[PDB]
Structure formats: C-alpha cells, structure tokens
Design a binder for this molecule. Structure first.
Ligand code: CL
Length: 164
C-alpha cells in the first residue's frame, strides 16, 4: 500500500515527538516517491537535520529546505525542480501534507503541513499526503510560529525515515 513515513522533531534541542505521514502514491506517485526518498536519505541527501523555517499559526508549518534552511533552497531526487503532478487531492483541513512552491512546476523538497483548511491553495500546490499520527506535535510546532513566519524556537527534524 501507500508509504508511511516519519519525522522526529525537536524544539530548542528537546524532542516534541513524532509526526507520521501517509503518502498518496496511488494518486501522486512521483511526488510521494520524492518525499519518501528524502525521508530515508537513500539518495545521499534529504530531510535529516533540517528545519521548519516558516511557521504561521492558524495556517501551516513549512519545512524541507535542507540546502539553504530559509525557503530559497532544496532539491528533489529527480533534479532541482519537478512538475506539478496533479491537483486531484484538496487542502481539506488540518493535517494535509502539500508541496511548497514558487509558481507552477517548481516543486523541489519544501513542503508544508496545514493546521486549517486552506482552499485557496487548491489547484496551485500539489497535495500528496496527510498526518496519520502526531497532530499534537504539529500543534506544538505551530505554536512556535508567528504572523511573519519566523519561528520563536529552533524546530529541527532530527530523524526521519520510512515505516512501511
Ligand atoms: Cl523508530
């Protein structure tokens, strides 16, 4: 079936717990595979040790820039950027996992976990999974964000990988 992956997250160097994500490889196989491989690190790079650099309460928590740690970087397993696969899945509510981007066909490695329904992103960002377990951890991360997106604690993915 669809992959299950995990992110273990610290805030200011102490663990918050684990976020478990189901990746909708049946719907968006290419997008799911990129994220899966970046969690395992099997290509020699990926999310381990990187940060949630942009977190906005009552919106979303954004991560995945493992090259520049600031929203300008990241790369996919395919190359620097890859196409929007489809917009079939929608930003239905809290726990949606979706690709950050800088316009059409600019997916790399950055992603976000929604903490509310974000319908205006439908048709613009590729949704590719959702939180199975660990919304409590997501709410903790969210609580360390701000209107500007600047975090008030350093939020680090210490470990990540594939469960099934
Ligand atoms: Cl484990």
């Amino acid at each position: 079936g669809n992959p299950l992956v995990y992110l273990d997250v610290d805030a200011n160097g102490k663990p918050l717990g684990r976020v478990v994500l189901e990746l909708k490889a049946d719907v968006v196989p290419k997008t799911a595979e990129n994220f899966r491989a970046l969690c395992t690190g099997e290509k020699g790079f990926g999310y381990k040790g990187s940060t949630f650099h942009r977190v906005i309460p009552s919106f979303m928590c954004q991560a995945g820039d493992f090259t520049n740690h600031n929203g300008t970087g990241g790369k996919s397993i395919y190359g620097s950027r890859f196409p929007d696969e489809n917009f079939t899945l929608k930003h239905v509510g809290p726990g949606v996992l979706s690709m950050a981007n800088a316009g059409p066909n600019t997916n790399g490695s950055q992603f976000f976990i929604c903490t509310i329904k974000t319908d205006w992103l439908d048709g613009k960002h590729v949704v590719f999974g959702h939180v199975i377990e660990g919304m409590d951890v997501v709410k903790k991360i969210e609580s360390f964000g701000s209107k500007s997106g600047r975090t008030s604690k350093k939020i680090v993915i210490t470990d990540c990988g594939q469960l099934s």
